[PDB]
């Protein structure tokens, strides 16, 4: 499994979020700048096979990571989706939610050339990971369980 492999560090992946049961990883072949996948660490074939507690916490992680990404890449919108079955477009059979950023215009200048739907240069993953992590950390400081400003 591609995701179980990334979780176990057997396959390369850039984490932007991680806790004991969940993680968010940059998509290797991003549809748009900042495209990220949020996944439960435990392996479930799809959304319908996951227990309610996992789905409930997954929804909360998706919110946090989405807020973080929107802030980091200054997105005007976000598309959230998960596919169940090959006829619905599922190709990785480990439950994951896509967070695909959108803009009414063009993405920030701070970001350089981007090749939609293809593998990017190493620099892309390193920068996106760092800025997204920075945005998420701030969200934990102003709206986290131990927020203070």
Q: Which residues are annotated as a binding site for Zn(2+)?
A: 1, 4, 43, 94
- Within residues 32-71, the interface with Zn ion by CB under 5 A covers 43
**Nearest CA-CA partner of 93 in 50, 33, 34:** 50
36 lies in the site for a copy of itself, by CB under 8 A:
no
4 lies in the site for Zn ion, by CB under 5 A: yes
Residues 107 and 116: their CA atoms lie apart, in Å, by 12
Sign of CA dihedral 26, 37, 33, 116: positive
Known catalytic membership, residue 35: no
Answer for the pair 69, 101: CB distance below 8 angstroms, yes or no.
Answer: yes
* Residue in 35, 70, 96, 133 annotated catalytic: 96
Binding mask 81-100 for Zn ion (x = CB under 5 A): -------------x------
String of DSSP letters for 86-143: GGGT--S-S--EEEEEE-SS---TTS----TTS---HHHHHHHHHHHHHHHHHHHHHH
Q: Which CB atom, from 17 or from 124, has the smaller least distance to Zn ion?
A: 17
Query: Interface with Zn ion by CB under 5 A: which residues?
Result: 1, 3-4, 43, 94
Query: Interface with a copy of itself by CB under 8 A: which residues?
Result: 47-48, 50, 52, 55-60, 62-63, 66-67, 70, 75-90, 100, 102-104
């Amino acid at each position: 499994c591609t995701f179980c492999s990334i979780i176990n560090r057997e396959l390369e992946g850039y984490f932007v979020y991680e806790d004991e049961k969940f993680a968010a990883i940059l998509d290797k072949y991003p549809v748009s700048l900042g495209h990220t996948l949020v996944i439960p660490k435990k392996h479930f074939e799809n959304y319908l096979e996951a227990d309610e507690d996992t789905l409930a916490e997954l929804a909360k992680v998706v919110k946090l990571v989405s807020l973080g990404i929107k802030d980091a890449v200054k997105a005007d919108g976000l598309r959230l989706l998960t596919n169940i079955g090959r006829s619905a477009g599922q190709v990785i059979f480990h439950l994951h939610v896509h967070i695909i950023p959108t803009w009414e215009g063009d993405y920030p200048d701070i970001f350089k050339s981007f090749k939609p739907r293809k593998e990017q240069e190493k620099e892309y993953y390193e920068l996106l990971q760092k800025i997204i992590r920075e945005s998420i950390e701030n969200l934990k400081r102003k709206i986290g369980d131990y927020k203070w400003g």
